[PDB]
Design an enzyme around this catalytic site. Structure first.
Site, short mmCIF file in Angstrom:
data_model
loop_
_atom_site.label_atom_id
_atom_site.label_comp_id
_atom_site.label_asym_id
_atom_site.label_seq_id
_atom_site.Cartn_x
_atom_site.Cartn_y
_atom_site.Cartn_z
N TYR A 95 0.82 -1.19 0.00
CA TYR A 95 0.00 0.00 0.00
C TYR A 95 0.87 1.26 0.00
CZ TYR A 95 -4.23 -2.79 0.61
OH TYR A 95 -5.25 -3.67 0.44
N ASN A 120 -14.14 -5.06 2.63
CA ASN A 120 -14.92 -5.10 1.40
C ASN A 120 -14.65 -6.28 0.48
OD1 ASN A 120 -12.47 -4.13 0.36
ND2 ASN A 120 -13.22 -2.03 0.08
N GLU A 123 1.31 -3.21 -9.01
CA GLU A 123 0.72 -4.20 -8.10
C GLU A 123 1.02 -5.65 -8.40
OE1 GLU A 123 -3.34 -3.36 -7.59
OE2 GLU A 123 -2.95 -1.99 -5.93
#
Lengths: 140, 136
Positions: free
Chosen positions: B50, B109, B123
């Site tokens: 992140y 989520n 990523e």
């Protein structure tokens, strides 16, 4: 009690894009995926794992297929998992697997039979070690 | 075009054994699982991932348990993964989207998805070696 067994989603199943459905049969049977990874075995990797069949007539053909494309090698964990995963899978040969088994619903020929799973505690421990390191497995 | 994207099935979804159902979502949508691994993210691993960033909350949840990180491939995969996941907050995601159907809160989520081409490459490369991604 609870146990861990090795399960492989084979190239043919992987290539049909049915990983989710098969994975749902396991989960919905109460088994949990505690370790998993997609990969493509090598001539050597396939042969190591299937060493047990090293002199049987289908060994050469088996190696060929288990290496022909990627698979999802994974460790299924749950109550009486070894026997459970066998029940889900059905007969090795698809033309003998009772309707509703992964092998009967997703495969036609014994060459391309969708999934692999260990057949005993002894091979379950051996097979899991072959493909996973204890620190890779995240029991939950 | 045929693009790739990073997908993660976050601890909440993995904890309730719905890996199958979400995976089937991608496959049926036309997407393909071209690389995958389950693993427990460490502190640095989560913080490392992140990088372009409540943070302490995100990191905390993303390491609370095992996850499945993976690459999805297929036509327009990056945005299709988005249209599929639904709004980042499940209290607003349209009915049927992965997030509305599996997710409680915006904090848990169910899924994650490369938010852009530039974010995808970053990523994907962070979790996977090229040689662990086998297209088809």
């Amino acid at each position: 009690a609870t146990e861990r067994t090795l399960s492989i989603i084979k190239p043919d199943a992987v290539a049909k894009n049915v990983i989710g459905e098969i994975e749902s049969r396991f989960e919905k049977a109460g088994l949990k995926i505690v370790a998993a990874k997609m990969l493509q075995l090598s001539q050597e990797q396939a042969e190591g794992f299937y060493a047990e069949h090293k002199e049987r007539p289908f060994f050469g053909d088996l190696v060929g297929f288990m290496t022909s494309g990627p698979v999802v090698v994974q460790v299924l964990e749950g109550e009486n998992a070894i026997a459970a995963n066998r029940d889900l899978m059905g007969a090795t040969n698809p033309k003998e697997a009772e309707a509703g088994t992964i092998r009967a619903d997703y495969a036609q020929s014994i060459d391309a039979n969708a999934v692999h799973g260990s057949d005993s505690p002894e091979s379950a421990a051996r097979e899991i070690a072959y493909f996973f390191a204890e620190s890779e497995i995240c029991s939950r």
